[PDB]
Design a protein around this nucleic acid. Structure first.
Lengths: 185, 38, 144, 35
RNA sequence: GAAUUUGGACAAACUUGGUCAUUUAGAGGAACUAAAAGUAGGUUUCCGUAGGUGAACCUGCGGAAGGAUCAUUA
RNA sequence: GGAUAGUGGCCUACCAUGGUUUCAACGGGUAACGGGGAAUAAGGGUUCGAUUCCGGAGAGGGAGCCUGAGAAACGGCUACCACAUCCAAGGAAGGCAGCAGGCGCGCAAAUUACCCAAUCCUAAUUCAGGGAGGUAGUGACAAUAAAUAACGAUACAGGGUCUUGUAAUUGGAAUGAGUACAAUGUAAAUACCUUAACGAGGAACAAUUGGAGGGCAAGUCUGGUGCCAGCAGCCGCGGUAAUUCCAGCUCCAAUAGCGUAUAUUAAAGUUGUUGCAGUUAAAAAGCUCGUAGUUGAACUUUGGGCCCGGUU
């Protein structure tokens, strides 16, 4: 009799599963961003469809309606603060013009690759998963962190994670011990 | 028979991207996906 | 025009005419008469379990034939007798007499599929283990 | 008569103007084995 | 103030005969199934009704085309 | 009038003959507890709602009753019916649709564990109790995040002095799945968060489930078995209503998930109010009258001027 815990699924599979154009576009996106499967594309498409539905039934509402003003301004503020929507496109017909790779650009994996420090997208994903990147002072090991605009200057190496100093890792430690006991004396 | 194992997960998708369109390997002019003895 | 009443105070005739016409459905009449709970070989169930009464040497043609056989089985809860297409060949040596098989449908939401006239069930499990694992030499059929 | 049926219906989309994969020794067989 | 007792309302249940509901035997019948393997004919098509007949079918009355408009006068 | 806590045919004595119904009464069925809600996305609808909240009803089936503010109570009593336990054979004692757990029925569902530490409840009451509740065990019901690899150097191959690929070539990096001092955690523990030490070179620490004429994305692959009054003659070829008879290779999709069965929803304008159809494809009563029902011509204060002040 405990109060129920609400859950919800955050992706939706396409209605027509075998068509060549959508499949090749999905593989294009997965190759250029370095994705594990198609579920990331489905997740972005699902939440973008949610955003587009909200924008549509606010644009159907009459102008100067207080609900339209409040929800539209909140939606534009949120999608600028995330960083997907540009600074010069703060309108509703312009948030209807959003695309999937615009959302996929703002991932931590793509943002840690594009800011140097990774030299590849798959190297960026491997570098993130192995707990090497901290936003501010918080270590993040998730490729889909969706970096804000205000923290773009804070993606750096962790205070842990030997690429940022602080006591090099296990393989180098074992190699140093091997060279010390064998080539030392 | 035994073969070197195929990569699993994300790298496999990466492989397909490398297989499909970076330096496209095998085409008959109309982008065949499964050739035999040419 | 267009046959139907259209006036504003005329919802009752629309209601009753729709109810009679809906009684001329196929799914509505099969659902509201309780046809599956009284007349179907299953009790409206997704799967069922049964006792293998007989196996018959049903081939597609004569000696140059395709080995595609079926068994005749009797249900546990209903007591009715049906017939079931067993899977791919090599499974006939697994299914002996009195094996307590578990059955499903064949794929037409309650009708026969395939070139076998009058068979709409498949033997999903035998002796409480499987057919897929038993045919792939992964698990073995328990004795008795 | 599966192979004969596939070959008979195989020629219609040539008449109706649609692409058809060219035939070989894989047509009238169980491509994927059953359970 | 207990054991016990009269009458009343509440009323489980029991016996008899009747009503209804579901299922299993039971002669006989009509239908059908794969049954590989049993005993040339006429050809308008129907509808309603009535009689006859191993099988469709045959005949009587009334209706329909869901049947192939030539030619000539004016 | 009686009865009730109280209105009341709730019951009794008397007297009237009334009350409901085609706007569907009454009777039957319901694999029917009702609602908040759930699934399905152009809408309107369609299907589901035993089940975390609210209300009702029941404690094996009926009936009756005591105590009490409150019960027709069943972890209270009494009787009957049906089950069923113990024996010294005289008698006694029952009620898990509370929590665990057993049989049974089935396609179909978990521990005879720990604790009142939290949330609250009861009591004479800060203290006791609570299978209410919480915690852990089983648990791929469903839901969320994302490991199974990354960077070079060599030798060639290209677009061609900068950019990618191949290989029984080679090099060092990095990290958690795990093994665990410790400490956090907790009523006490398990686990998560943190971390001393150990922990990767491929048959390691190896990902599966489905499918390939078309539907629908993916083969002008390979081998074996069986038959032929067809050619050859012991090599073989071709055909094989073998609906491929059996295996392997290659390729495609989804991916810690994938397949199958049943039901339902969408596509479905095959229920059509929106929104079907009726000469010939399913379907206009043989025709007319006619009650309910549905629907029903036009007309009745319009126009003009006055000011003020609201929103762009």
């Amino acid at each position: 009799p405990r109060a129920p815990r609400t859950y919800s699924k955050t992706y939706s599979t396409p209605k027509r599963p075998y068509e060549s154009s959508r499949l090749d576009a999905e593989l294009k996106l997965a190759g250029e961003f370095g994705l594990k499967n198609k579920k990331e594309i489905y997740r972005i498409s699902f939440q973008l469809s949610k955003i587009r539905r909200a924008a549509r039934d606010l644009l159907t509402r009459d102008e100067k309606d207080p609900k339209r003003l409040f929800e539209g301004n909140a939606l534009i503020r949120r999608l600028v603060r995330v960083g997907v929507l540009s600074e010069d496109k703060k309108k509703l017909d312009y948030v209807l013009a959003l695309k999937v790779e615009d959302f996929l650009e703002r991932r931590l994996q793509t943002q840690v690759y594009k800011l140097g420090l990774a030299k590849s997208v798959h190297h960026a994903r491997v570098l993130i998963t192995q707990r090497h990147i901290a936003v501010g002072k918080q270590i993040v090991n998730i490729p889909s962190f969706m970096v804000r605009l205000d923290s773009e200057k804070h993606i750096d190496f962790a205070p842990t994670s030997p690429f940022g100093g602080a006591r090099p890792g296990r393989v180098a430690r074992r190699n140093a011990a091997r060279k010390a006991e064998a080539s030392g004396e | 028979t035994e073969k070197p194992k195929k990569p699993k997960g994300r790298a496999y998708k990466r492989l397909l991207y490398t297989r499909r369109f970076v330096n496209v390997t095998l085409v008959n002019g109309k982008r065949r996906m499964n050739p035999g003895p040419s | 025009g267009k046959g139907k009443p259209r006036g504003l105070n005329s919802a009752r005739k629309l209601r009753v005419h729709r109810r009679n016409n809906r009684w001329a459905e196929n799914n509505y009449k099969k659902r509201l008469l309780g046809t599956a709970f009284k007349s179907s070989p299953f009790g409206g169930s997704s799967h069922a379990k049964g006792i293998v009464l007989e196996k018959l040497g049903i081939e597609s043609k004569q000696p140059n034939s395709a080995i595609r056989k079926c068994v005749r089985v009797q249900l546990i809860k209903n007591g009715k007798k049906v017939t079931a297409f067993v899977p791919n060949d090599g499974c006939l040596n697994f299914v002996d007499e009195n094996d307590e098989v578990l059955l499903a449908g064949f794929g037409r939401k309650g009708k026969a599929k395939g070139d076998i006239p009058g068979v709409r069930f498949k033997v999903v499990k035998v002796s409480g283990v499987s057919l897929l694992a038993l045919w792939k030499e992964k698990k073995e059929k328990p004795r008795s | 008569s599966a192979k004969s049926f596939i070959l008979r219906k195989k020629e219609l989309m040539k008449r109706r103007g649609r692409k058809v994969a060219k035939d070989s020794k894989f047509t009238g067989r169980k491509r994927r084995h059953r359970f």
